[PDB]
Design a protein around this ligand. Structure first.
Ligand SMILES: C[As](C)(=O)[O-]
Ligand SMILES: C[As](C)(=O)[O-]
Ligand SMILES: C[As](C)(=O)[O-]
Ligand SMILES: [Zn+2]
Ligand SMILES: [Zn+2]
Ligand SMILES: [Zn+2]
Ligand SMILES: [Zn+2]
Ligand SMILES: [Zn+2]
Ligand SMILES: [Zn+2]
Length: 71
């Protein structure tokens, strides 16, 4: 619903990953970049988790109509 999607929108804006006219792929990339840190650099599995969760979150953002579908 709009409330859940709005909370998601606000949070992503506040985290500095969501912007205007952004495609799903771009949002996912921005989230993964902000998720990088000591653990993603040291362990492949953590780096993969970061990318997979980022993609999943961007997907939820798209469903919430916050980003454009990849074409
Ligand atoms: C794995 As994707 C960026 O098509 O949701
Ligand atoms: C299901 As999709 C539009 O995130 O590849
Ligand atoms: C159209 As919008 C989700 O960038 O306010
Ligand atoms: Zn907006
Ligand atoms: Zn806008
Ligand atoms: Zn790119
Ligand atoms: Zn990467
Ligand atoms: Zn391991
Ligand atoms: Zn997806």
């Amino acid at each position: 619903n709009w409330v859940a999607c709005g909370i998601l929108e606000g949070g992503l804006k506040a985290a500095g990953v969501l912007e205007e006219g952004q495609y799903n792929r771009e949002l996912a990339e921005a989230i993964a970049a902000k998720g990088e840190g000591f653990w993603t650099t040291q362990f492949p599995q953590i780096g993969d988790w970061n990318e997979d969760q980022a993609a999943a979150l961007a997907d939820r953002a798209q469903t919430c109509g916050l980003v454009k579908a990849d074409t």
